[PDB]
Amino acid sequence: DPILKRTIISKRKAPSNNEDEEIVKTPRKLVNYVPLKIFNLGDSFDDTITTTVAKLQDLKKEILDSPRSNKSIVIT
Amino acid sequence: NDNPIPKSVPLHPKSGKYFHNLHARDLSNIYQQCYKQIDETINQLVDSTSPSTIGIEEQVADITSTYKLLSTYESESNSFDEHIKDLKKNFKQSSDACPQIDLSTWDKYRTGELTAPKLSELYLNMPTPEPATMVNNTDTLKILKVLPYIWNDPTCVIPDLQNPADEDDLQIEGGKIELTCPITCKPYEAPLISRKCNHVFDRDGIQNYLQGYTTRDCPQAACSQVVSMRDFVRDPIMELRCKIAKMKESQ
């Protein structure tokens, strides 16, 4: 059993002083039904602006659907 | 002490029936029964004494003492009854003020952090039942306060019901009372008295001076008011004094 791998891993712990309650615990209130959880994860980049990209998605095709360059065919 | 047993816990409505069930028995039946008895043991001796019989003052004094003891008995017996009622009333107030227990709060009280009422002690020191609030006077003793001197001699106004000796101190003011009326010489059977008039007529005929009008003046004289026959009531002095007269007017 090579020494280095387990040297890298650690198992030492301190379960002596740590307690789940610092002094005591606050009991659940009879109306402790706070909805909460209105929002958990996200907010990387604004998304309404991404709606603009969604709009460009078909704006590109709408603009493609038109006469485009090399229209110098006028005579007389 | 040094045990899970706590001193006390506030009232629980589960056995509140028992709290209300607390109720003392009543003795008014026995009291009235013995009152009737003592009131008996006094009629017969009015005429059953011998002509040579001389001295019953000690008898009447003993009877009066016994009655006074009985009057105290009933008075403070009542007092205990009202105080017992007040005990359970105060306990109800305490229960209303008691922070009723539930869940695991019973241990917190067992720590001795908060108290609870204990009617046992509240009764050990119940509202002082000191003897007070009584003004005792009854016809049953109106008869005893006068029958000794009447028995000595019925024809004598010893009691004026004002000051123990008499109403008047240094004068003959007043009047000797003759029972049988000269208008109706026949003996009385059971006439009635108005307290203010301090006079009676005969078992029947108290409607003497009525012709259309239904009331008139005091019987003989020295009066400032007309009679009210709805105020007439039984008086013991009449037969109390007539008994000896009937017994002795012989031989």
């Binding site: 090579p2 | 006390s8 029964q33 059953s48 011998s50 008898q59 017996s77 205990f80 695991s104």
Partner: protein, 316 residues
Amino acid sequence: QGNEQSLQKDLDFKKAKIVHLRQESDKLRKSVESLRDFQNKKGEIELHSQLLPYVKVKDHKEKLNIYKEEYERAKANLRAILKDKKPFANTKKTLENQVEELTEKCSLKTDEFLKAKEKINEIFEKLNTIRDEVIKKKNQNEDDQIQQLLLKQRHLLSKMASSMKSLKNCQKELISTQILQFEAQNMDVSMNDVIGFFNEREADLKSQYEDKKKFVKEMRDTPEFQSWMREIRSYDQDTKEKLNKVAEKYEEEGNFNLSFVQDVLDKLESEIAMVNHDESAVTILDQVTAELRELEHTVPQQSKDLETIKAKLKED
């Protein structure tokens, strides 16, 4: 002169090609160093995966520790209370003892309450006949037997006066007794409820203890827990301590890194951006090294060709 029009313009064009290929020579050096940086993942990803990432191994370790320390609270609180019922059983025994006290007490004070009522009433029997006897004697008018008859009432009244004595104590004692009993009775009711309240708490703690035992058991033998010697045994045919090559550098990047919480997301993405534009002209190295050298050499070659050409031009 036409030969010159040809040689000089071709020499300018190939020099333009030389500078164009230089524009990608640096790009190819960048591509080589970029591929080496890309392969850096070969060491990094494999190492924190071979030594499974700390956010997994040490995460399991710490959550196991917190679950283990949770393991004892419920049972510790339970040890005292589960046996405290026996003290509670003894308290209930004491309360039913006070119930027996209630029974015997109330019974005997009821007995003296009957004693008092009987003593007054039944003795009232002879109190009654006094008048019957006296009137009976009196009816014999027709010599002096009246005295002893007239003496009775005194002693009779004294007897009844003395009789009322008890009544009072009897009356008071009973209630006093009853109330004491009631209070105790009251105490009794409270306790029975208390056991129940506690028993419900005991059931809650027992359920919680079993629940945390379930989490303790499941926390181990998990797929990653079962993965012991699999994230490590990807060296099925090279477990010969030869991994020490990365030992010191990875140790510096690890324990003394001052940061080991899903820090992979720092480079696992940046590698994607850099690698997404590469592999273009990868094998164009030879032209930029030998063909370019030949072209730049023919620069002097045809330069001297033009020297001789303009020399013949001067010879004109």
